[PDB]
Amino acid sequence: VGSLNCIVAVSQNMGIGKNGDLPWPPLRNEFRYFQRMTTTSSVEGKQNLVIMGKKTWFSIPEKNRPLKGRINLVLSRELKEPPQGAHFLSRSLDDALKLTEQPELANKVDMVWIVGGSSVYKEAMNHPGHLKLFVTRIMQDFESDTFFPEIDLEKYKLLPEYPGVLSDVQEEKGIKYKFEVYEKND
């Protein structure tokens, strides 16, 4: 198993969700970027694992579930089996990560991507180790009910560039946004 990474899109006021959807109208090229970065392996014959919470799973349009070409694992302590379409179910972040180190998965998984929501991100971000955050900055305020945890800039360094990631400002439907990558190692 290779890298651990978080990926999120976040408004200026730290917003990630509202009423079970995103705070902003759909940005196709943002979703396209998410799909590309999560799906692309850097190895041959291995797949990336995506780890998400239960509400994140059900916020994905059913036609896009499971996220194709990735191993989809959902976190929940209430569910007793993976949701229709999902692959694995785990009861904690330690267990999903322990689970990747099984003979079954260990030589099948390249990257592991945590794709939301707030509690999964907070635990990973505050756990010692090598972790990168792929953060799309949505360059305005949007009314939100679910937020991204604080990024401690003393530990996470914004990288000045990264392969396969545009640095420049983008715009779709009158909303400007920008792709960033952060890295810690502690």
Ligand X SMILES: *[C][C@@]1(*)=C(*)(*)(*)(S[C@]2(*)=[C][C]=C(F)C(F)=C2(*)(*)F*)[S@@](*)(*)C2(*)(*)(*)=C1(*)(*)[C@](*)([N])=N(*)C(*)(*)([N]*)=[N@@]2(*)*
The catalytic site residues sit at 22, 30
Using rule CB under 6 A, residue 131 touches ligand X: no
Is residue 4 left, alpha or beta, with left meaning phi > 0 and alpha meaning psi from -120 to 50? beta
- 57's enclosing H/E stretch is helix 54-59
CB distance 167 to 40 below 8 Å: no
Q: Closest approach of Cβ 107 to ligand NDP, in Å?
A: 25
Q: Which stretch binds ligand NDP (CB under 6 A): 48-56, 80-88, 157-165, 171-179?
A: 48-56
Choice between 80 and 172, CB closer to ligand X: 172
The interface with ligand X within residues 90-119 (CB under 6 A) comprises 115-116
Indicate the residue type of 18.
K
Which of 107, 26, 44, 39 has the alpha carbon at shortest distance from 72? 39
Q: How far is the CB of 107 from ligand X (least distance, A)?
A: 26
91 binds, among ligand X, ligand NDP, none (CB under 5 to 8 A by kind): ligand NDP
CB closer to ligand NDP, 1 vs 14: 14
Distances (CA, A) of 178 to 12, 20, 170, 172, 175: 12, 23, 6, 11, 10
- Could you tell which of ligand X, ligand NDP, none binds residue 61, using a CB distance below 5 to 8 A set by kind? ligand X
Q: Which helix (H) or strand (E) holds 105?
A: helix 103-106
Q: Does 171 bind ligand NDP (CB under 6 A)?
A: no
Which residues would be at the binding site for ligand X (CB under 6 A)?
7-9, 30-31, 34, 56, 59-61, 64, 115-116, 136
